[PDB]
């Protein structure tokens, strides 16, 4: 078990139902937390798994529209010209976000020789207490920072003290079972949370 105080400027957890309009999630997506944990420290033997999702700041939705292109880069066309395929998509942001997520790690099948638990635990602890990471984490989109800090129990306040409202179906994690390494085709299943008296809990498959 590890407590991560993920907090940055804004957030934009793009949902799976509305992919054209990057609407942000009310909290931190479990897939986003897994990607953050992989960007902080990951090896072809570890498997980051989220457990408890917590909230530390009230929701502040800001209407922001992003202007993108509608053509992918390839070896066929040399240039794309964004002025031709300009699309004014939506990307609602969440001003001032903070999450003290509780997540640990397990083991995979392609470990081999480096399959230690305490070694990876102390490595992640040192990386969180010193500032080492393979890539800067993202809060739904690679445009906001994540001032992660290894906490011991509780160090910040939460606004959701009592029962508020459930978020319904949330994107858990993409199915990586029936997929070769460096996958390119899978699904995105969702799941139900529980009671929101201080966040949401992620039920493992």
């Amino acid at each position: 078990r590890f407590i991560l105080e993920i907090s940055g400027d804004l957030a934009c957890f793009t949902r799976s139902e509305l992919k054209v309009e990057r609407v942000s999630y009310p909290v931190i997506t479990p897939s986003a937390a897994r990607n953050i944990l992989m960007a902080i420290l990951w090896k072809p033997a570890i498997r980051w798994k989220v457990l408890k999702i917590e909230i530390l700041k009230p929701i502040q939705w800001t209407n922001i529209r992003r202007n993108e292109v509608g053509t992918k880069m390839s070896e066929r066309s040399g240039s794309l010209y964004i002025e031709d395929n300009r699309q004014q998509r939506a990307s609602m942001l969440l001003k001032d976000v903070a999450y003290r997520i509780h997540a640990d790690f397990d083991m995979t099948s392609e470990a081999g020789e480096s399959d230690n638990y305490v070694k990876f635990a102390e490595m992640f602890k040192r990386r969180a207490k010193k500032g080492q990471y393979f890539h800067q984490p993202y809060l739904g989109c690679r445009e906001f920072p994540c001032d992660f800090r290894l906490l011991e129990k509780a160090e910040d306040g939460l606004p959701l003290e009592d029962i508020t409202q459930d978020f319904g179906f949330m994107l858990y994690d993409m199915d990586f079972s029936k997929s070769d390494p460096r996958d390119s085709n899978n699904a995105e299943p969702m799941f139900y949370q529980c009671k929101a008296v201080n966040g949401v809990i992620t039920v493992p498959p």
């Binding site: 800001t62 880069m73 010209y81 001003k95 906001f144 001032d147 992660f148």
Partner: protein, 264 residues
Amino acid sequence: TIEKRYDFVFLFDVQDGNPNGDPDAGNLPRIDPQTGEGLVTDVCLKRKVRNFIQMTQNDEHHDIFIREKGILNKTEAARQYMCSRYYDIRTFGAVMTTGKNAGQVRGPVQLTFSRSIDPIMTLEHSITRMAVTNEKDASETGDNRTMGRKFTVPYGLYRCHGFISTHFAKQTGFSENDLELFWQALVNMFDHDHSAARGQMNARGLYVFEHSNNLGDAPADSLFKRIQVVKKDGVEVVRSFDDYLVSVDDKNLEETKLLRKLGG
């Protein structure tokens, strides 16, 4: 190929124009609907970097791929060719139809949504045009008019964060010359690109911190809390740089980190 991590904060001020408009509601500058500070996106910074790279090169080994129509108009082998040719591939990663991880690469250069410190006031002066674009209802014999609106900012100071790691530069090919070109662009990307809407945008402070380790021996929260940009004493509202106050903290990063001031 670089071997050290670079965490930079770039302070830029728009004087008489729109730093970043809101595509949601017409064309008003991006502001926070809560604290009132401007929320300039990093896509404008990326466009300025691309334009500066296109200007200062105009040749091979530094192409833009995603260029502008109004400015100029097996797997690992193709990826290596795209990295060695286009500079935007080494900058913001590689993204083609084929590849390893679904043909996607993050990239070393990763900017941040610029957030202001003081609440600015977007000036929306609805100017009038003494002509007509098409055959609208106001294009009659009375007065061919097409009244619009102009959005400007009296003084918007924003701070953009950026992190460049050598782990991604080893795969994308971001060498020391590429880093020097990126710095030279960041110094004068707003000076080489101007318009009637963006107006005058200048630089203030390019505070860079180079770490000895390949992953970074210092968190980002302490690096952000070190450089403090606040207001003066008797100053009520913002107007120019003489009203702000920037305080650095070079007494704690003198152990292993190296400080660079390529702007002020």
